[PDB]
Design a protein around this ligand. Sequence first.
Ligand SMILES: CC[C@@H](C)N1C(=O)/C(=C\c2ccc(O)cc2)SC1=S
Ligand SMILES: CC[C@@H](C)N1C(=O)/C(=C\c2ccc(O)cc2)SC1=S
Ligand SMILES: [Mn+2]
Ligand SMILES: [Mn+2]
Length: 331
Amino acid sequence: IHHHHHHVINLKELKILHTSDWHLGVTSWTSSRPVDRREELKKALDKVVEEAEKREVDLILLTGDLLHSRNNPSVVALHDLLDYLKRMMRTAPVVVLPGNHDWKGLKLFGNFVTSISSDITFVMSFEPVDVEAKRGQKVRILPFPYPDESEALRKNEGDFRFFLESRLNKLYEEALKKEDFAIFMGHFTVEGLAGYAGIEQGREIIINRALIPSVVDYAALGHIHSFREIQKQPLTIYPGSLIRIDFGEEADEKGAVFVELKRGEPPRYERIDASPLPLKTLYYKKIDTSALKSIRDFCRNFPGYVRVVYEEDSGILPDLMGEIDNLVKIE
Ligand SMILES: CC[C@@H](C)N1C(=O)/C(=C\c2ccc(O)cc2)SC1=S
Ligand SMILES: CC[C@@H](C)N1C(=O)/C(=C\c2ccc(O)cc2)SC1=S
Ligand SMILES: [Mn+2]
Ligand SMILES: [Mn+2]
């Protein structure tokens, strides 16, 4: 019973697990009623890990912000990240495209970890890397990380947009230089999203979906919280977060993406539902006796969190947050 990669001859298939935007260490609604989302997030994370072992994925892709805090993650958040990273590695080889971190030492540690292990790879530049999947599949990764060299901080609108296109063009040329499979990994915002509102904000890199290399077998994206099927040629998917961060994601479906690739057959995928706690926003003109009736009746049998939005004040409001544990925000 070994624990290394297999080597099947003439194998032309590739099962991929794509999850993104874990936001580990997040505490929601700190200005109204602080709620630690760790237990819910870990539960959702466990379900994704189990599904990876269930379907026996060949490669695991990680994008978006795995940590909620960009430049100051808690010890607990870091612990959970390293925990689930190891859990992923026991299942299949992992490829990680980090988001915004603002720490220079991270690239050093990223290259170090990548060098000492054959089951995890950190792409923190535009340099394409070749990786080996669980069953010995040759997979070329075309990474498009967040633009560095202070180009995001300061750059002319003409050159910067031409800079992004030039980088994408080189990724296209190098995608043709592939052995078996070629996967695109990007950390940006697709031009004209319908209708993910509330990002970032934050700095945004706007890229047309047509500029993404068409010769790749799969385009793995992140940074946005909602699931999005951008296109089919090539298959471009935002997995979305695993939990509902704020009430803007009330009607969102959270989870991961399972992608299967064949040499002759076109790409197919299934959504892996994480089934996180639901959210709900109740609207009222004034919080009258009728409004209090509706609020208490709804929050009674609701397994998730509730926000109440009203227009104008009308007398002293009862301690609703006291009698109702579900109510996290009356704004
Ligand atoms: C080093 C790879 C991995 C564990 N990782 C981080 O450590 C990341 C961010 C980070 C680490 C330490 C800090 O003080 C701040 C950010 S993101 C990421 S993937
Ligand atoms: C794998 C950890 C190893 C490279 N290491 C450090 O990172 C050490 C110290 C250190 C790292 C980051 C800091 O911000 C400060 C000290 S000592 C030591 S051995
Ligand atoms: Mn991001
Ligand atoms: Mn995010």
